Amino acid sequence: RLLEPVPFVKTNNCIKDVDADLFIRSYATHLKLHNKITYPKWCTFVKTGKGRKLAPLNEDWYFIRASSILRRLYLHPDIGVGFLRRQFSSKQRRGVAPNHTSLASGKILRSILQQLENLGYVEQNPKKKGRRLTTKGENAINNFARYINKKVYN
Amino acid sequence: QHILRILNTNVDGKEKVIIALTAIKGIGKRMATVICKQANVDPTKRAGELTTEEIDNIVHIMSTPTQFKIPDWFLNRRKDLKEGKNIHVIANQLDSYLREDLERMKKIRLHRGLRHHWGLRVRGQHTK
Amino acid sequence: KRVQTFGKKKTAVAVATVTNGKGLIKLNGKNLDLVEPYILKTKVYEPLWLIGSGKLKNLDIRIRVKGGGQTSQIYAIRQAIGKGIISYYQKYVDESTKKELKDVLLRYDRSLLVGDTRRCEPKKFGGKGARARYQKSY
Amino acid sequence: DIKLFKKWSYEEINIADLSLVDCIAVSQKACVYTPHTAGRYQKKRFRKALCPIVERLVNSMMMHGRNNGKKLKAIRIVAYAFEIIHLMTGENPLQVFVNAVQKGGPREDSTRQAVDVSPLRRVNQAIYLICTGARNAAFRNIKSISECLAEEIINCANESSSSYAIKKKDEIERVAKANR
Amino acid sequence: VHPKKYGQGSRQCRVCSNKHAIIRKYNINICRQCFRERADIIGFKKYR
Amino acid sequence: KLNHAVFIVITPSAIAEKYKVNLSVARAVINHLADSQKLYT
Amino acid sequence: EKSKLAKVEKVLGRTGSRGGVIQVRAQFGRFLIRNVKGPVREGDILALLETEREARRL
Amino acid sequence: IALTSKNLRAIEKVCSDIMKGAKEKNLNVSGPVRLPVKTLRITTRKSPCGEGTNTWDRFELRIYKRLIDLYSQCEVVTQMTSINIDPVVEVEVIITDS
RNA sequence: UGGGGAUAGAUUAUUGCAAUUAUUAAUCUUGAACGAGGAAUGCCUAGUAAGCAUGAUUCAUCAGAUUGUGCUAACUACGUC
RNA sequence: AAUUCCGAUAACGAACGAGAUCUUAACCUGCUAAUUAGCGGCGAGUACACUGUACUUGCUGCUUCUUAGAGGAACAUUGUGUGUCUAACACAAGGAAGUUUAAGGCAACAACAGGUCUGUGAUGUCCUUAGAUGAACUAGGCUGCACGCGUGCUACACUGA
């Protein structure tokens, strides 16, 4: 499935050279295994955003959210919280009323961003306005991306 | 095994445990799910594999759930305006309380109580 | 050296940059396979399969896709690769070889060469649709 | 050389009523690796002939209410349906489709005295009958659509009363024969 | 008197003093019927 | 109405047909046997 | 029952109450006059059922 | 200078006249920069009253902006521009050292 | 049925002088009809139909409205009175 | 497509309408142009390879793509059929485009006692004017409901939630 024959030359030097999901799941799993970032306990009782209108119902999601956010940060080098809230937005059935997209819950996002920042992965600056990716994180993400690419490929 | 009856029917047993738990009250599902996690009966299994001890634990968690980590805002039947303060009150007791509140409204009198006594909806449907 | 060209289906635009290289192909910062739907993936690989693997081995290709939705982007990419390969051979390689190549692409499909020009018919009052109307009743 | 999904060869056919082969038109410039080609098919009356027979099958299959415009899922269902066909019975799926169209089309019908059915119309009607049969089967019915579509294609290819399309064709052909 | 500086009764057409049907887009402040009498000289020409 | 249960072509429908099982249980059997829809073994 | 073959040579005219019928000359003498339903082009081949039932031209 | 108008042809005439005027005197202009056209569109119900069919007309006010950056003494270029304009063209200052 | 979200019950917010006839908002709980619709009758021919959204208009606050705009891209002719 | 043309023809000649005009959208000018658009040029790192690829701060020929001015481009062009073989149509080819390229906008004559004085300081007459039908303030109400009819919204699930 994941492997298929290729008619052009792959580079395998970055996260931009490997599919989102495999990188995301493995990095999430690795992060939880290492135990760098907390659950945290209160986070199990709340929803990702109002378009869900239900429990998140998938256990390991917080690490996934962190993993996707980290990837988004390499993808787009300067962003803040609002960008995340907009990213993870989806559609909300309002019962009888029509659907609208509805923003993701900002505390859980704010907390993830803050934990990464504490661990040297991401950085609040004035030179570039919001959160950017920062150097220990940049190196780690790049290297982990190589480690995964080789491990998956053959 | 399968085909259980708890406080109310719960004959669910090929069915997943969490949805079986909903079948009492907490059909809103979040309340049932948080209680299931806190009780720590595992969502993976079918309801014919429930332990009696696990069911008792669920009743224990359900009873006054402020003392676990389940949030006060998340909790139903909150202020319940009186000198005291309340919690979600379950099943026939919940119905009894709702009925009690309607009885209080009829005595109290304001338009919602009066419409309710009469047999007419709360916000209006526009019956024209 | 380098030639730059485009493809345009619906409101999508895909710019193709065809330079001297080795056979590396990217789509924005990201490798060519990473575009998602497996069915429409084959459509974008389609010009590579019509032209074999040798011709790209001398050339690196960079692509920038902006605007339009999913189907529109795929066709715009497919179109841009077509327009790119043929234009590079007209400036740099050889006009007879280019004509042969153009013949192969034309023989398969004209849609690759020149985009479909269909675009929206405006909404007109008296109904939600472009031509569709509110339900009349007696 | 070229092959459908990288899986099905498309260099072999049977000759049908001769008309149907001319209409369905599996040939090199009508070949493509995957369904989804959206070229102008409403240019003139005859133009539907040039539209690939697999493309036509996907377009028809996508059609009905809530499922409209969701063309990639419909394509996914046909690809899976051919894969199911390949395993369930001993032939190449492309051939199984040719057999289904050759059996499936009704040849005579009545508007006022029965009249003959034109071959382009016969192909369209067959494709419609196969897809409508799949839809009738699918709804609320537990078995998945890829399998249900696969069952219609094999049963139509065989000729059976376990196909809606053959049953409907039988119904059309009998009424026309009786009327006229 | 007791006016409000918000809501429907707060405002009225610049030309005719009707309270209804006022274009406040671009801050025109004219009712649409009045606007139709003026629509060429203001520059709001018809085309397509 | 359901009459399928816990105990005794790799599609979920085929398994459900052969052994008279619910489709989640059919999936469970598939997973056991092996050791939305996608390529087959 | 069984198909037999005649090749459409010429389209004469569109007929019937709602216009859906078409008058056609078909080659199986070995001419056959037909009334056909649904779009027909010249060089189409038409599947016959009851083969001796030659039509009345209008 | 920056030129803003609701008359295309008037802006065009101004553009040519300052272009000729400058090019006599060897002046440095950065060639006519046409800004994206903005249209103020108003979507208007026809009929002052409801009756008859719902019939709308769509009004468009199309405004033209054009831009030239220039290195010279201000006074001559503004004087050449200001006398040569028709008042439907609105002239705004822009100036550079290179 | 974990479909369906009408209905109700309890909240804390937010706009406003004024929110009760629940303005609007979220949160938990509450879980109605409805199994593809009789007789009838509407719209539609290619980027349309359908499906999916969304910008703008009103706006102190209020889209299930209207008007724009895109994306997802069918069927069936291609004619007859 | 069209009292559009041809043709016939006690009429010949006209005019308005219609086409045409105009606004978009459709394609080409390696001409016209670079700002608050791109593209390169080039310094500098961070990352990986390996005799380039990915990613950020600083300076700064190109205009293909972003934008928008001017200008080009189809007339049924060529070929083949059908047609008084006349107006013209049909098919195939060429072509960015072949149903006047697609969409609009504009709206003859003569009407309707159609709609609107609840848009107007457009306006006749008739009513009213300090216990006002003026101006103005506080509540209530336009949404109430045995019940009848419109237009929409949301559904009835597994091509699904």
Coordinates of C-alpha atoms (C1' of nucleotides) in Angstrom, one line a residue, chain I residues 25-77:
Chain I
rA25 C1' -23.9 32.2 22.4
rA26 C1' -21.9 28.1 24.1
rU27 C1' -22.3 23.5 28.1
rC28 C1' -24.3 19.4 30.0
rU29 C1' -28.7 16.7 30.2
rU30 C1' -33.9 15.7 27.3
rG31 C1' -34.4 11.9 22.1
rA32 C1' -40.9 13.6 19.0
rA33 C1' -42.5 12.7 13.9
rC34 C1' -39.8 10.5 10.0
rG35 C1' -38.9 3.4 6.8
rA36 C1' -38.4 7.8 0.0
rG37 C1' -44.0 10.5 0.2
rG38 C1' -51.2 10.0 -2.1
rA39 C1' -54.0 13.0 -5.9
rA40 C1' -51.2 16.4 -7.9
rU41 C1' -47.5 19.7 -9.6
rG42 C1' -42.1 22.7 -10.4
rC43 C1' -37.3 23.5 -12.5
rC44 C1' -33.7 22.0 -16.0
rU45 C1' -29.5 21.1 -22.1
rA46 C1' -22.7 22.0 -20.3
rG47 C1' -18.8 23.9 -16.2
rU48 C1' -24.7 24.2 -16.4
rA49 C1' -28.5 20.4 -13.3
rA50 C1' -27.4 18.5 -8.7
rG51 C1' -24.4 18.7 -4.2
rC52 C1' -21.4 21.4 -1.3
rA53 C1' -20.1 25.8 0.8
rU54 C1' -19.0 30.9 1.3
rG55 C1' -18.7 36.8 0.4
rA56 C1' -22.0 40.9 0.3
rU57 C1' -27.1 43.2 1.5
rU58 C1' -30.0 44.5 5.9
rC59 C1' -26.9 45.0 11.2
rA60 C1' -26.5 48.4 18.0
rU61 C1' -27.8 43.0 18.1
rC62 C1' -30.4 39.1 14.5
rA63 C1' -29.8 34.3 8.0
rG64 C1' -32.9 29.0 7.5
rA65 C1' -34.0 35.4 3.2
rU66 C1' -32.1 37.7 -1.1
rU67 C1' -28.1 38.6 -4.1
rG68 C1' -23.2 37.6 -5.8
rU69 C1' -19.1 34.1 -6.1
rG70 C1' -16.6 29.7 -6.4
rC71 C1' -15.5 24.4 -5.7
rU72 C1' -17.2 19.4 -6.4
rA73 C1' -18.9 18.2 -12.7
rA74 C1' -24.1 14.0 -13.7
rC75 C1' -28.2 12.1 -16.5
rU76 C1' -30.6 12.8 -21.5
rA77 C1' -31.3 14.5 -26.1

